[PDB]
């Protein structure tokens, strides 16, 4: 079974609209991510081995960690109900190209600890990535990492982590 | 490292109140389980490979799953607010032994689709398991399941997926 790109896939599915799409992602208050939706693959080309064991912060685009930041700081106040992000999210597919997003996002707390113990984002796509469309492909040699560099997410996830083991007010 | 009952543990801590205990489990809406306590297992003896692919009904008191079904209809109408059991709740423990356990329940509600994707579980013991008290232990030769056969479990499961496939009112 090959896996193709939403682009690659048009030539064979030839009535369906697939820059309409969205995708959720779920992660844990350790950070760390317990569910991408399948469907999203030919729009990042992340598997679920490219993701045991790492955070959202793997992949986000990496000045835009802010609305992932600010995401979670309005979760624990608005004690789980829809929060909407302060700005776009841009995602990095494997092989580079950036996906746009527009995300809004949730949060489960347990009503006996009343720490936040789930994250999800709803990601809405603005289009198709920009970069190369072959998202499934491996990235360029000598490219720029447009993620953040392992310190600053281990920066970015220690105060996330923070944020979730508070009681929510 | 030895794994040992929490009866043997009293041994070794002689102040300790083991009778006093509560744990948490986790399922998805596929039933599937996706958390146990590590802290269950001198009270049950259940591993996490034990658990793998299975649900709360592959330990569950036989004649108690009414408890857990009930359980996911109050969630249902009450939208993951605190539910609490209609009776108390016994669990099979690895060797055999039975654990009764007072539970109450939550629920996660993704606020896209209106469907409970998450339920949680917190279950208070009411004392140590009556029977041999090694739930480390396999359980012996020769004793009756307690535990829905295959074929009911998969019967009772197929209805709480139904349930938690209902958008919530």
């Given at each position: 079974?090959?896996?193709?790109?939403?682009?690659?896939?048009?030539?064979?599915?030839?009535?369906?609209?697939?820059?309409?799409?969205?995708?959720?992602?779920?992660?844990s208050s350790t950070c760390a991510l317990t569910h991408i939706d399948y469907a999203s693959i030919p729009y990042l080309g992340?598997?679920?081995?490219?993701?045991?064991?790492?955070?959202?912060?793997?992949?986000?685009?990496?000045?835009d960690v802010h609305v992932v930041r600010q995401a979670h700081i309005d979760l624990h106040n608005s004690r789980g109900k829809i929060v909407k992000s302060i700005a776009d999210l841009r995602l990095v597919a494997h092989n580079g190209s950036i996906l746009r997003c527009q995300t809004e996002w949730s949060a489960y707390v347990n009503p006996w600890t009343?720490?936040?113990?789930?994250?999800?984002?709803?990601?809405?796509?603005?289009?198709?990535?920009?970069?190369?469309?072959?998202?499934?492909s491996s990235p360029p040699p000598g490219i720029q990492s447009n993620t953040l560099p392992p310190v600053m997410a281990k920066t970015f996830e220690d105060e996330l982590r923070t944020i979730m083991n508070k009681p929510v007010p």
């Open positions: 079974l090959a896996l193709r790109s939403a682009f690659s896939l048009q030539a064979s599915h030839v009535s369906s609209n697939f820059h309409v799409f969205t995708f959720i992602t779920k992660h992340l598997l679920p081995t490219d993701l045991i064991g790492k955070s959202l912060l793997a992949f986000v685009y990496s000045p009343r720490k936040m113990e789930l994250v999800v984002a709803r990601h809405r796509i603005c289009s198709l990535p920009i970069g190369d469309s072959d998202v499934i």
